[PDB]
């Protein structure tokens with residue numbers, strides 16, 4: 072049998088470098104929710120696997136120029152990896168070129184502010200210019216705003232796409248650092264899962280405000296034609312019904328709390 | 333060629349309800365609700381014509397233990413009586429082994445309905461007392477959750493529910509709602525958060541959802557294995573999700589209609 076190549080991304084608390092990782096080897100370098108999830112899926116499906124961090128550090132978008140997929144989606148589409156086990160958002164355009172399991176986690180786009188910022192809704196953001204705001208590159212959130220027809224959401228896209236300097240960031244960690252460093256002049260649009268994790272991490276200076284802007288899920292992704300597609304989907308549902316997904320969430324979000332795409 | 337698609341669904345408010353003047357009407361026009369509109373939207377993005385049919389046993393779907401025959405909407409798909417189910421039908425592992433589901437169009441979890449003022453705030457609360465009975469719907473995903481759970485609190489509940497006399501189980505959501513309302517706080521109903529939240533905004537506004545949700549999952553649109561409709565419908569659901577149409581329909585049928593304003 073073949074060792075299954077799992078593309079994933081460095082995103083806390085889903086995948087994280089262990090403390091002394093530089094002397095560690097292979098899968099053992101990494102910890103977190105998706106690292107556990109991978110082990111769970113692989114157990115129930117009976118395969119050996121190798122975690123590989125996505126080379127370009129992106130979730131995945133299709134270049135408008137060349138129509139070439141980057142990120143984790145690209146690794147699957149071009150035969151570089153066999154499965155993606157990541158906080159990878161189920162979308163129509165992605166479903167057109169890869170397969171997704173039933174979701175293992177729900178999320179929605181959300182607003183992160185530095186505590187005390189005078190904002191509580193997307194509409195609030197759209198109606199001012201003092202406080203800048205942006206999203207991750209090459210993910211589902213930027214794409215949600217590029218395509219939304221909803222007034223406020225289209226208004227925000229028109230601002231973000233032309234703002235100088237760039238309001239987009241390469242990594243979620245860069246987005247939070249900006250909110251943290253901007254003395255309240257940068258708000259960050261990100262998935263509620265990541266917002267809710269950051270909110271329980273020192274220095275406890277960020278906050279989720281307002282309700283989510285949309286409703287969707289993360290799913291384990293496979294190349295078209297993969298023999299793994301069905302075994303993995305049934306694995307996800309079994310882990311859901313066994314409470315394991317709830318246990319993993321509590322382990323990596325709240326067991327880990329410090330402040331009580 | 334093109335043949336009319338048979339839709340199996342279930343009279344479950346606000347998903348499929350009889351229109352006020354239903355006796356004057358024929359076919360699809362007799363019905364209204366979240367899933368009536370959803371069926372309309374799916375049919376239009378997939379380009380098929382369809383008949384809404386109400387599941388004859390009024391059940392969601394489970395496999396009998398002696399015969400191993402599926403009842404409910406699941407049975408209608410499995411045994412070839414319907415072409416698609418467009419209903420609040422919970423995606424589960426046992427059902428995914430015999431039918432296909434689209435990606436979810438709606439999120440939900442098991443929850444607790446109480447008569448206002450009942451001294452219960454959680455599932456643990458229910459499990460640690462005997463004065464207040466509690467139950468679930470038959471032939472649905474919530475009963476099976478308790479039957480199979482290995483979590484101590486939920487198993488304790490099943491062990492009680494399964495042997496209680498008289499029966500704590502109901503044949504329809506309506507009959508659980510009624511039992512809560514007429515038992516003076518001595519009955520609590522376990523039901524999906526979506527339906528709990530809907531009932532909470534309906535007169536006489538004497539029920540409340542309490543405690544967190546006990547699990548997390550979704551409803552999908554289901555098709556029999558081999559169905560030509562599987563991929564078009566799956567993509568239609570995602571288009572409708574991203575267009576915000578699924579959000580628009582939830583509001584239409586839950587909150588814009590608030591009377592307190594499986």
Ligand SMILES: O=S1(=O)NCc2cccc(-c3ccc(-c4ccccc4F)cc3)c2O1
Pocket residue numbers: 173174175176177178286287288289307308311316423435436437438439440548549550551573578
């Ligand atoms: O049972 S699932 O099919 N499998 C297990 C599971 C576990 C946790 C969450 C879900 C889950 C459920 C639903 C939604 C969802 C809701 C609205 C629009 C689009 C969506 F996608 C997302 C996620 C979930 O869905």
Ligand SMILES: [Cl-]
Pocket residue numbers: none
């Ligand atoms: Cl390395």
Ligand code: NA
Pocket residue numbers: 314317546547
């Ligand atoms: Na659980």
